[PDB]
Structure 1
Amino acid sequence: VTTFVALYDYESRTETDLSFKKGERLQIVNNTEGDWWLAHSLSTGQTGYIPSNYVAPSDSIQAEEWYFGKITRRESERLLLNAENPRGTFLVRESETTKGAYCLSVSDFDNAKGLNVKHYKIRKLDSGGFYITSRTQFNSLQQLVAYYSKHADGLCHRLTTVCPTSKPQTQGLAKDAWEIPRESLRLEVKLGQGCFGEVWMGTWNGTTRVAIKTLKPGTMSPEAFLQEAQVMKKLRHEKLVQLYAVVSEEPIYIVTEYMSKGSLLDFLKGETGKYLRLPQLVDMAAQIASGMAYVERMNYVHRDLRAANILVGENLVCKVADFGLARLIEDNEYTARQGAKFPIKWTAPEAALYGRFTIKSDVWSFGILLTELTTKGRVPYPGMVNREVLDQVERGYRMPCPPECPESLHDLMCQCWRKEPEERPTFEYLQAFLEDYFTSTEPQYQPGENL
């Protein structure tokens, strides 16, 4: 039994889980594994299961507000570059490139680069202490942060503000919540309409904001959906919209992680996508590619990858939604890859012609998606009707490089559009290509030699 501290507030939805406020002290066992831990709160004397990502052991670095653990270099920059953060906003993370070194990431402002993030490798001493520059050593990470909060002393700027963040999603709505009753869900605001149902913002069990998709009766077999949903339930990645729960009887409701900024396609159009710069668009493509690289690793298939099925959150977070759902659609026309509801302009020819949906036809759809990303959301094949597209694509026509899409990205698109699926790149490749698309000379980490 270790004492853990609550990193965030958590409102107890159910009977068996535990409500707690941040800073509460909770007793939890030695080895316990999984997403939900049994806890006893010393602070309240109350008992119940807790989401394990909401706690850390007392008096660890993981309990420190400014410690973001395994966050990626690119993702730390996403959070730190929020325009509301003052200069000197910071976090500490593990180094991606150097053993059990840590890294201090700090927001800054420059007359050359503007708003930018500087990264300082924090190395550990034989003593167990830490240092950024060997001339100034500390016994602990906390002492290090305290010192550079008072004096830049070589750093680009004094540490001012702990990087802010939203409470993380829990994994599942509760321990053992999966098939839920319609009554647990309050549909609050209808957000959109599709061919086969609607999308809602809602609340589960009076506590938790969720998205709810409602399907038109007869869209899918409830039994088939349930069987697939067991498979989708296992797909867990920061760039995949989480599938929380399902109401299995007609009409089917699908309960999902709520994404505050709506679909990428809508986002690209209108009063916010007009301003996006290429590095932001490439970072959004890189997030999407990372989610699809997980799908690829898991030997799954999206089947309808396009901007309308990417959802946007705070700070240009992008997540893949509705993976695998298209396969269950019971509509004679759609299943034929035919009709006004089939996204033929995103569909690889072998998927259109022979129904061969694979990760490589998703790769083709990603190439089309890159086209939406670089045109503020214009429909692909602009002057072509859905009826012509397949034959043109089979004959070898490919969209030209959109205006103000760099040629190197269009060459990436053309790779995604090879006729032969096995000659299209992997999402693994796409993610690395897009993550490394912009480079510099040697500035990765600030030379902490002598500040």
Structure 2
Amino acid sequence: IDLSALNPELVQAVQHVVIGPSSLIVHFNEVIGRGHFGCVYHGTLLDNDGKKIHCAVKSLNRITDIGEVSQFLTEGIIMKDFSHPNVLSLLGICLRSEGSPLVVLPYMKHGDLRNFIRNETHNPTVKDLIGFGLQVAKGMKYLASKKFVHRDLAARNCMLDEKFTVKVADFGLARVMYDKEYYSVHNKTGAKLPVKWMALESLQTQKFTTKSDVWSFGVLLWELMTRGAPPYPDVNTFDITVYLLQGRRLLQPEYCPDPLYEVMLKCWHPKAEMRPSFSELVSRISAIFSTFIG
């Protein structure tokens, strides 16, 4: 990657996001995870006093050309501003002269939320599951306040830290600014569209908004209440649009309380403008959660 060809204003603006070998040790032989985007390694970040911070280092192996690198730096500036207890922070990025760009994130002791709830050795209560959903709603309320449209909200993209605090995050492809580019990149790399989490209007028009993130949030609540069941497992991705157009939705999970399933149905309202906001979802889910004992 030719770092000398970048826009000098953009280089100045992104400097506060860049971290390098003076503080970060990437443990390339200790792999946390492997995805279609690249790999996630254990990393160590040292502060000025020599104190060690455990981190996850996501390698975005597909970012190579100047336009992709510039868009990566712009996304790092946007996400470096994130500060919320239910949003995974960006510690920094690495733009090396040799190797792919790196995203440095706080290490998440308990991994992704979908894996946690699906594991038969774990026993989260119905109250714990609603609590996870409420944490996701708070993180999404913060992101929505920044006009940040997630597009890929699903239980597998929320992480659990050492205290079981849920952090909204993104372990998918490199984030793009424009919806047209999001579709173009998925087609070019083979990366899967998250069809079964997408709002009806996103499937038909190829556009995403905070109102389509509310639809994905409803699917995420359903994943929580089923302990990670795959949504519409029996509906082919190419038949999902007709299924939604018939007025059909994900069925009420056995352990999902009625008021919470009513919240899910409101998230999947066919008219995007009629869906609740993330602020209304936080208020409503807090009220439901307040009636669970434990």
Could you tell me the TM-score, scaled by structure 2's length?
0.81
Aligned to 2:169: 321
Aligned to 1:361: 212
**Structure-2 change in CA distance of 1:371 and 1:219 (3 Å):** farther
Q: Secondary structure at the match of 1:327?
A: coil
**Structure-2 change in CA distance of 1:376 and 1:288 (3 Å):** same
User: 1:304·1:326 contact (CA, 8 Å) conserved in 2?
Assistant: no
**Partner Cα separation in structure 2 for residue 281 and residue 219 of structure 1:** 40
Match of 1:201 among 35, 42, 45: 42
Match of 1:230 among 57, 65, 77: 77
Residue 412 in structure 1 maps to residue 263 in structure 2: yes
Residue 265 in structure 1 maps to residue 104 in structure 2: no
**Partner Cα separation in structure 2 for residue 258 and residue 411 of structure 1:** 35
Aligned to 1:248: 95
Q: Deviations over 1:13-45 (max 9, x none)?
A: xxxxxxxxxxxxxxxxxxxxxxxxxxxxxxxxx
Match of 1:428 among 255, 279, 286: 279
CA-based RMSD of the aligned residues comes to 2.5
Q: Secondary structure at the match of 1:357?
A: coil
**Partner Cα separation in structure 1 for residue 20 and residue 164 of structure 2:** 33
Quote how far apart the aligned CAs of 1:271 are. Answer: 4.0
Match of 2:26 among 164, 186, 191: 186
Q: Secondary structure at the match of 2:55?
A: strand
**Partner Cα separation in structure 1 for residue 145 and residue 211 of structure 2:** 13
**Partner Cα separation in structure 2 for residue 230 and residue 439 of structure 1:** 37
Q: Secondary structure at the match of 2:288?
A: coil
Q: Which amino acid counterpart does residue 241 of structure 1 have in structure 2?
A: L
Aligned to 1:309: 157
Aligned to 1:217: 62
Q: Deviations over 1:171-212 (max 9, x none)?
A: xxxxx7521236733226211111111222211247221111
Deviates more, 1:419-428 or 1:349-358: 349-358
**Partner Cα separation in structure 1 for residue 136 and residue 209 of structure 2:** 17
**Partner Cα separation in structure 2 for residue 304 and residue 217 of structure 1:** 18
User: 2:60·2:174 contact (CA, 8 Å) conserved in 1?
Assistant: no
Q: Secondary structure at the match of 1:209?
A: strand
**Partner Cα separation in structure 1 for residue 290 and residue 82 of structure 2:** 32
**Structure-2 change in CA distance of 1:182 and 1:391 (3 Å):** farther
**Partner Cα separation in structure 2 for residue 438 and residue 369 of structure 1:** 16
**Structure-2 change in CA distance of 1:257 and 1:439 (3 Å):** closer
Aligned to 2:184: 332
User: 2:153·2:217 contact (CA, 8 Å) conserved in 1?
Assistant: yes
User: 1:303·1:327 contact (CA, 8 Å) conserved in 2?
Assistant: no
Q: Secondary structure at the match of 2:128?
A: helix
**Partner Cα separation in structure 2 for residue 257 and residue 314 of structure 1:** 11
**Structure 2: gaps spanning 5 or more residues:** 1-14
Could you tell me the TM-score, scaled by structure 1's length?
0.54
Q: Secondary structure at the match of 1:319?
A: strand
**Structure-2 change in CA distance of 1:333 and 1:353 (3 Å):** farther
Q: Deviations over 1:80-136 (max 9, x none)?
A: xxxxxxxxxxxxxxxxxxxxxxxxxxxxxxxxxxxxxxxxxxxxxxxxxxxxxxxxx
**After the TM superposition, which residues 101-180 of structure 1 pair with which residues of structure 2 at under 5 Å, given as runs?**
178-180=17-19
User: 2:260·2:288 contact (CA, 8 Å) conserved in 1?
Assistant: no
**Structure-2 change in CA distance of 1:335 and 1:348 (3 Å):** farther
**Structure-2 change in CA distance of 1:228 and 1:438 (3 Å):** closer
Q: Deviations over 1:126-177 (max 9, x none)?
A: xxxxxxxxxxxxxxxxxxxxxxxxxxxxxxxxxxxxxxxxxxxxxxxxxx75
User: 1:303·1:326 contact (CA, 8 Å) conserved in 2?
Assistant: no
Aligned to 1:91: none
Q: Which amino acid counterpart does residue 334 of structure 1 have in structure 2?
A: H
User: 2:26·2:41 contact (CA, 8 Å) conserved in 1?
Assistant: no
User: 2:259·2:288 contact (CA, 8 Å) conserved in 1?
Assistant: no
User: 1:264·1:307 contact (CA, 8 Å) conserved in 2?
Assistant: yes
User: 2:139·2:168 contact (CA, 8 Å) conserved in 1?
Assistant: yes
Quote how far apart the aligned CAs of 1:325 are. Answer: 5.1
Q: Which amino acid counterpart does residue 62 of structure 2 have in structure 1?
A: P
**Structure 1: gaps spanning 5 or more residues:** 1-175, 441-451
**Structure-2 change in CA distance of 1:202 and 1:403 (3 Å):** same
Quote how far apart the aligned CAs of 1:272 are. Answer: 4.6
Quote how far apart the aligned CAs of 1:353 are. Answer: 2.1
Quote how far apart the aligned CAs of 1:330 are. Answer: 6.5
Quote how far apart the aligned CAs of 1:439 are. Answer: 4.1
**Partner Cα separation in structure 2 for residue 272 and residue 215 of structure 1:** 32
**Structure-2 change in CA distance of 1:326 and 1:388 (3 Å):** farther
Q: Greater relative contact order: 1 or 2 (C-alpha under 8 angstroms, separation 6 or more)?
A: 2
**Partner Cα separation in structure 1 for residue 269 and residue 182 of structure 2:** 30
Which one has the largest radius of gyration?
1
Q: Deviations over 1:36-74 (max 9, x none)?
A: xxxxxxxxxxxxxxxxxxxxxxxxxxxxxxxxxxxxxxx
**Partner Cα separation in structure 2 for residue 261 and residue 374 of structure 1:** 19
Quote how far apart the aligned CAs of 1:340 are. Answer: 6.1
